[PDB]
Design a protein around this ligand. Structure first.
Ligand SMILES: Nc1ncnc2c1ncn2[C@@H]1O[C@H](COP(=O)(O)OP(=O)(O)O)[C@@H](O)[C@H]1O
Ligand SMILES: [Mg+2]
Lengths: 125, 524, 50, 165
């Protein structure tokens, strides 16, 4: 905002934010939602992740790590995060153990800029 | 808007993020249920809130909406004594708006809390609503006033198919009488902020903002707004419905609304049940979707069509929020993840998808071709599991035709499907169907100096669209003239254009063939 | 977790049945072609026995 | 004389008051707003009402003060026919399709005119002549002046080279 600049942000790990809030939320006396997380799980990520964005003044370009607990991608902590992201990188354990590193399962992955308008036609095809 | 204060009902006692409870002021006035209340954050500014609990003590449970950081304990609370009304009309179109009604910078009011039309108020759905997709408009046809669910995983094309349905209306709406124009209302519940901006620009570039208004409650904004966002969306549509006009309502998505309502319910100590949701989470979506309807001739004959989106986690329909919305809506449009990555886009799983009022909803012309397609694809799917028959050839071409990025015009869709039905793409190979379809719509081979001689029927004349809708293709007026156009197009395409494929077996020509064919998938 | 994996185990057997049913049905066609024989047979090797 | 709706309640057949509202038209989008107001007051459009609307589509300019993008009196006109035939269940009489033929020759869209005289001749067994020669005049007008089709699209020999845009 102030200096007006392109900046990188590196959050390792964004699950630990949600998990940290899950500890206090129990002791604060809130009733837990699905899978024992705080009821404000979507709202906690909302106010944090919305601040991470490219404004007119400058530009944040945030890489984040997301822990998938028990390799369960349907869990609220990653599932809620997926909606916020521009390029979702999904790492699979079976791909890692087979020998392929990095362990990126390309079918579950996605990117917004995977589009003939942004990247070249030869890239997309 | 700036709401109307009346009486100072109490003081703020506790806050818990976006929820609060009040203590009543001396006298114990008692605010009415489900009404707006203004909390004085400063002498000049207020902060809105909705009443959700009226306890025996005199205490009043509040759902915070505006200026949540500025709310504090001990602040004064003024009451409206009224249900939430918002700005509604034609003047609100082409703008982004909150559930409370404030415009986002980038008209008589109407109640958000309203009962749905009763038994004698409604009528059977007859008017069609074109999504602009050959897969949908044939097999899973949506009628005006119908509630058609969109389900599937993340990045399966749930938003795109809903947004392109709004964009498909502009070509019709521009040409038709404004009485029958489909005014759209895209509700964005719990989404990322930049996603709303990209949809705004995408709607603006296709001229959709003229016939569209964008309800918006982003992820930054609180649960109170997200909870109320689909209700504010329908209110804006009901104006057009009750005043004899047809409307469309997209909720993107009801999954994030439920999570926002669960937050509100849990924070106010409402007893939770299945997957920690309250008892009335079914009632939440039910009273929303039932307000979408097709009214009778006695009350204008207007409509609000609903396209609720509901995200599933790894193709799991057994989840509580997903199973609830399926039981309310009139069937669904299931988007499979394997079909998306496989190639088929939109990735519409026809076996899983269904429209409960399909036949009556379709156009007379579209009903003619589509009735046969159900018989062909049924036999093709069975024979594919278990030597090429006529159904096997023609069935495979339909699958190639269903792939499309942007929505097709009704004339350009139905003719390319009619060609495949009567078997004009049998000699044409499966990979060259999109090149065949492109040369049918934009270009024309008969007129391309030679064997033309048609008196009226051509594809460049887009105005024939509405004559086809009246008379159908299978009719003495257009049947003979249409079958000329297709006979000229096939014979010339097979002779002059498809002859290249036996030829082209070299570097820089095979690649040129690919780049040509890949671009043909996008433009229908 | 368990809800997804037991479904994917069940989806595994569904693909198993469909592929094995393809072998079943294909070998019926061969069995129909092959049984065009039982009506004939045997009389061709009369003097082969001697 | 008497009529009933789908439930069986009484319906207002008094059409004549709503007809004179459509005559004071000015711009043809206002005719639709009247057609809404009849249905709202349990008074379904009569066969004469649709023809009175069809008249206003022909006579006036387009929607209202400002012009809309890609105006089409024919498309607005043919939508109204689809409403009366399929949904409301009313066969358009000889007057209905004569208003359609007038708009083809007036705007100059002769290619539509060829299709709709075929329609008007068949089924409803009537050839109005007056407009047939006026339509055929516009057909010859396109041929002798320059060319009848788009022109730039037709002549350009594609074959492998076709622009995708
Ligand atoms: N019919 C289609 N053809 C090609 N690409 C599509 C189609 N529909 C969606 N997409 C692509 O898929 C991606 C995700 O689409 P989106 O509508 O955001 O899905 P979801 O709402 O399920 O996340 C986008 O980048 C979009 O370009
Ligand atoms: Mg989406």
């Amino acid at each position: 905002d102030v200096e007006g600049q392109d900046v990188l942000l590196f959050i390792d790990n964004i699950f630990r934010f949600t998990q940290a809030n899950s500890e206090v939320s129990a002791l604060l006396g809130r009733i837990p939602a699905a899978v024992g997380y705080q009821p404000t799980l979507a709202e906690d990520l909302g106010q944090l992740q919305e601040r991470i964005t490219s404004t007119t003044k400058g530009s944040i370009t945030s890489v984040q790590a997301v822990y998938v607990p028990a390799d369960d991608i349907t869990d609220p902590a990653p599932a809620t995060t997926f909606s916020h992201l521009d390029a979702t990188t999904v790492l699979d354990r079976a791909v890692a153990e087979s020998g392929i590193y990095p362990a990126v399962n390309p079918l579950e992955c996605a990117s917004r800029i995977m589009d003939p308008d942004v990247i070249s036609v030869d890239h997309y095809n | 808007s700036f709401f109307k204060t009346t009486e100072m009902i109490g003081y703020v006692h506790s806050i818990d993020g976006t929820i609060a409870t009040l203590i009543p002021a001396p006298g114990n006035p008692g605010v009415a249920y489900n009404t707006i209340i203004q909390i004085q954050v400063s002498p000049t500014t207020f902060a809105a809130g909705l009443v959700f609990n009226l306890e025996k003590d005199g205490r009043i449970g509040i759902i915070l909406m505006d200026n949540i950081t500025e709310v504090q304990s001990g602040q004064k609370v003024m009451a409206t004594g009224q249900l939430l009304h918002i700005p509604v009309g034609a003047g609100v179109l082409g703008k982004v708006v909150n559930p409370l009604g404030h415009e986002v910078p980038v008209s008589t009011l109407g109640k958000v809390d309203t009962g749905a039309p009763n038994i004698v108020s409604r009528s059977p759905v007859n008017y069609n609503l074109l999504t602009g997709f050959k897969a949908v408009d044939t097999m899973i046809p949506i009628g005006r006033g119908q509630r058609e669910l969109i389900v599937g995983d993340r990045q399966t094309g749930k938003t795109s198919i809903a947004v392109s349905t709004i964009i498909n209306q502009v070509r019709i709406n521009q040409q038709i009488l404004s009485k029958n124009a489909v005014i759209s209302i895209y509700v964005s519940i719990g989404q990322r902020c930049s996603n709303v901006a990209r949809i705004h620009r995408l709607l603006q570039s296709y001229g959709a903002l003229r016939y569209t208004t964008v309800m918006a409650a982003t992820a930054a904004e609180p649960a109170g707004l997200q909870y109320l966002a689909p209700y504010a969306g329908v209110t804006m549509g009901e104006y057009f419905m009750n005043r004899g006009r047809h409307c469309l309502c997209v909720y993107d998505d009801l999954s994030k609304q439920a999570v926002a309502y669960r937050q509100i319910s849990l924070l106010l100590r409402r007893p939770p049940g299945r997957e920690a949701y309250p008892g009335d989470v079914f009632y939440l979506h039910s009273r929303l979707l039932e307000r979408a309807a097709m009214l009778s001739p006695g009350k204008g004959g207007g409509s609000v069509t609903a396209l609720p989106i509901v995200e599933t986690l790894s193709n799991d329909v057994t989840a509580y929020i997903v199973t609830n919305v399926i039981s309310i809506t009139d069937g669904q449009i299931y988007l499979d993840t394997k079909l998306f990555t496989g190639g088929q886009r939109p990735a519409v799983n026809i076996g899983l998808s269904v429209s409960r009022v399909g036949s009556s909803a379709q156009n007379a012309a579209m009903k003619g071709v589509a009735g046969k397609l159900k018989g062909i694809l049924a036999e093709y799917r069975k024979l594919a599991a278990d030597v090429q028959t006529i159904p096997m050839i023609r069935g495979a071409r339909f699958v190639a035709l269903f792939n499309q990025k942007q929505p097709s015009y009704f004339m350009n869709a139905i003719v390319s499907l009619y060609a495949c039905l009567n078997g004009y793409l049998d000699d044409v190979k499966v990979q060259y169907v999109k090149f065949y379809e492109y040369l049918l719509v934009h270009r024309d081979l008969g007129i391309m100096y030679g064997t033309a001689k048609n008196k009226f029927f051509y594809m460049y004349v887009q105005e024939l669209n509405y004559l086809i809708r009246f008379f159908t293709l299978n009719s003495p007026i257009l049947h003979g003239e249409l079958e000329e156009m297709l006979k000229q197009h096939t014979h010339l395409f097979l002779q002059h254009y498809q002859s290249k494929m036996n030829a082209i077996k070299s570097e820089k020509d095979v690649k040129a063939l690919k780049n040509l064919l890949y671009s043909c998938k996008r433009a229908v | 977790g368990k809800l997804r994996l037991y479904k994917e185990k069940l989806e595994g057997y569904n693909r198993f049945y469909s592929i094995v049913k393809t072998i079943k049905m294909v070998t019926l066609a061969k069995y129909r072609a092959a049984q065009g024989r039982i009506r004939t047979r045997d009389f061709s090797l009369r003097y082969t026995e001697l | 004389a008497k009529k009933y709706d789908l439930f069986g309640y009484e319906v207002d057949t008094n059409t004549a008051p709503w007809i004179e509202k459509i005559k004071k038209c000015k711009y043809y989008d206002e005719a639709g707003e009247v057609l809404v107001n009849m249905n709202v007051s349990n008074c379904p459009p009569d066969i004469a009402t649709y023809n009175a609307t069809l008249q206003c589509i022909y006579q006036s300019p387009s929607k209202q003060s400002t012009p809309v993008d890609n105006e089409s009196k024919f498309c607005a006109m043919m939508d109204l026919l689809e409403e009366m035939q399929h949904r409301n269940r009313l066969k358009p009489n000889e007057e209905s399709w004569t208003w359609v033929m007038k708009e083809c020759v007036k705007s100059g869209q002769f290619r539509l005119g060829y299709c709709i005289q075929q329609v008007m001749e068949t089924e409803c067994k009537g050839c109005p002549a007056d407009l047939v020669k006026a339509n055929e005049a516009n057909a010859q007008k396109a041929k002798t002046e320059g060319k009848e089709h788009p022109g730039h699209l037709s002549q350009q020999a594609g074959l492998f080279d076709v622009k995708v845009e």
